A paper describes a structure:
Bacteriophage Casadabanvirus [name], from the order Caudoviricetes, is a temperate phage that infects the bacterium Pseudomonas aeruginosa. The virion of bacteriophage [name] is composed of an icosahedral capsid, long flexible non-contractile tail, and a baseplate. Using its baseplate, [name] attaches to Pseudomonas aeruginosa via the bacterial type IV pilus, whose subsequent retraction brings the phage to the bacterial cell surface.
Each [name] (gp42) interacts with two adaptor proteins. The interactions between adaptor and stopper proteins are mainly electrostatic. Whereas the surface charge of the adaptor interface is positive, the interacting residues of the [name] are mostly negatively charged. Homologues of the [name] are found in the head-to-tail joining interface of the Rhodobacter capsulatus gene transfer agent, bacteriophage SPP1, and bacteriophage λ. Whereas the neck regions of bacteriophages SPP1 and λ are formed of three consecutive rings of adaptor, stopper, and tail-to-head joining proteins (gp15, gp16, gp17 for SPP1 and gpW, gpFII, gpU for phage λ), the neck of bacteriophage [name] has only adaptor and stopper proteins. The hexamer of stopper proteins provides an interface for tail attachment.
Numbering used by the authors:
A (entry chain A), B (entry chain A), C (entry chain A), D (entry chain A), E (entry chain A), F (entry chain A): 9 to 32, 36 to 147
Amino acid sequence: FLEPLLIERIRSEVPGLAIVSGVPTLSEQDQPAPSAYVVYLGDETGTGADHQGGQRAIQTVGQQWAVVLVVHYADSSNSGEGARREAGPLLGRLVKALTGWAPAIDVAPLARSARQSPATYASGYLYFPLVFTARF
Amino acid sequence: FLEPLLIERIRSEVPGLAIVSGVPTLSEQDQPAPSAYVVYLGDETGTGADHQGGQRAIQTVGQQWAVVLVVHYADSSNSGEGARREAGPLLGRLVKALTGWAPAIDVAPLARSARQSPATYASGYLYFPLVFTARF
Amino acid sequence: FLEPLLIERIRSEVPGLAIVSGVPTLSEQDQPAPSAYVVYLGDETGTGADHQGGQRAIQTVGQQWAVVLVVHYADSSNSGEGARREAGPLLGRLVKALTGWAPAIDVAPLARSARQSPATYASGYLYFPLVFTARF
Amino acid sequence: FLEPLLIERIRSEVPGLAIVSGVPTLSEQDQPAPSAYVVYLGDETGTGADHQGGQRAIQTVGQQWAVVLVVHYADSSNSGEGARREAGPLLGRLVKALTGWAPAIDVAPLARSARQSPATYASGYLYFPLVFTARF
Amino acid sequence: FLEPLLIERIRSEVPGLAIVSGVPTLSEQDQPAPSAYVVYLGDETGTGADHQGGQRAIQTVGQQWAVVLVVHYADSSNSGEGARREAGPLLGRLVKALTGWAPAIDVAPLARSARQSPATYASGYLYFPLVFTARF
Amino acid sequence: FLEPLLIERIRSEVPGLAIVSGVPTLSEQDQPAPSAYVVYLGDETGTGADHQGGQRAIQTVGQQWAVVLVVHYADSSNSGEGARREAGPLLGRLVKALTGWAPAIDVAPLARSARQSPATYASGYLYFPLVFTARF
């Protein structure tokens, strides 16, 4: 219950052309700019372990959080050259800022996943079903 | 089955500009005032324990209850400065009045959660998936 | 399979102004009169116990049945004074007539719940998620 | 796989005024005649018992089948007098013809339920959630 | 992965009047001809047995497949005489051609069910919820 | 998280007449060309085994991926001659390129299924519910 203090800098208006898009199916044909395009998948819950405490019946609630990549630059049905090759550094930047960059945390792990996040394509332009953990 | 006696003062017409809004997705762009914006999540049920009694097959039914924060003041895609920093006292007020302030209760715990209620943002303005327990 | 014989008197046309309303979301703003406003929640089923018999594979089927309270008299966003305080006797009348007043019953318990039926408000006028058992 | 031979007489055009109604929510206000008004609930399945055989992986499949009663004669919001009191013989006729009257059956029990079939009212005119077994 | 070689003869344009109907609710009132009217129910899956192998994590997947009978000849709300009595040979033909007539099969059982396939009527003209297995 | 490097060549614009079709129900009557027509089925997940590791709570996530075949050439309600007989080599090409052709993979098995992928027809022209594994 303290993430906003760092979320403020986590979010930095990634797209320069998209304005008031309310970003978080994709168009892939008329998007003004390659915005972050965050997505939500689900949640993780469990008890009967170190997560659960005493009063208030709360536990360390597992949280899910994913993103969608929209570049379509150098990849317009030609080949996957420049779609993720350029994203690599961008993917690292996104995964390091939006996740893994947490405030002073005691019971808020803010789990981050640098690797082991497979993504498969479809629709003929670009799909990226990212899989990351939040834990908070 | 006695909460209304204190609910009467729990609710005190938080918004001064919103009238007959039937508050309990959000707009985040044309809301007249920062109302309480309460939300409902689910329920908790269980038997075979101290909750269950004899006749009437009733038990201490776990109840879920959450809220949504809508301020968008000092936080208009600029930064999370003034969104929750000002809410902190307001969040405490809300969580202490709407929850944890119960009448003479014998089997109505009215559980309250001051901490351990994480919230994540999205849509580019403000999201707050509050997680609180009611137990009644 | 004999409840109608007493249901006939259970139902007595509670509202004097509402006519052919087909009562069993609520409006809370243009309702002519405070009708009973019965609601249905679900069912309870189980076997491998005294409920199950021999032939016909039938058992004492648990039945769920609830009501909604619509008074909005002395409680019009002012305070919860007169909403349930006046309902108390009315709630007892409803729960004693509609439930617990059964015909000659051998395997039809017709369970009734005088207490332990919590209700929470929302929408800014009145909500009452009653929880009662029927067992038949 | 032989029921039609007796279904032919099971069905005998109960309503005299309803024509091509395709009977199997109810109106309760403009129905020409009190038709049978059969309804379907679900199915029952199980293996690892005498139901399952050898080849073809088939078993004695439990089947669910219910009916809806629509009389609204002598019961028009007045009282439950003549709604089920007259139905009693009619209910027996329906449950004995539509169910329990099976052809030469070896693995087709065609279970019938004379009693233990509770029904609850609602909507202000008449409801009858009949519960019967078919087993085939 | 070889069924088409025999499916080619399995399907033989059963209806002579229905053209480009895309057959696999029914009308029962304006159908030009009594087509096969195949239907799909679900699937059967399982592991940890002889079905599962080594690589490719595949197993002998249970497959469900059913049909709907539409004759309405000699059975037009009169009686079930000629609806299934004439279908009997037709039902055998359908169940022997569409199922049980498989190519050279090693791990494709193509299960067939001659008997033990109950069907119940409704809607006042004809219903036939056939239950057959495919296993492939 | 490296598949695109080979996906780039996996996808090679199979249809020559279909342009900007956004391929991944089918029409089967006005399709310009026999495109790949990939489909998605679901996912496979599991823990408590060699899949799960230490930090990041990730595991070798099972992935599902299937295709739909649309040829309708030499098979136009005549017979299944030329529908899959010609597809055989095409099916092998598709299953070898789109699957089983993976980059340098350490924890990305990219499972491929040459056989044991049954497909059943329906709708009167062509259906092919392919079943393949991706594991990544």
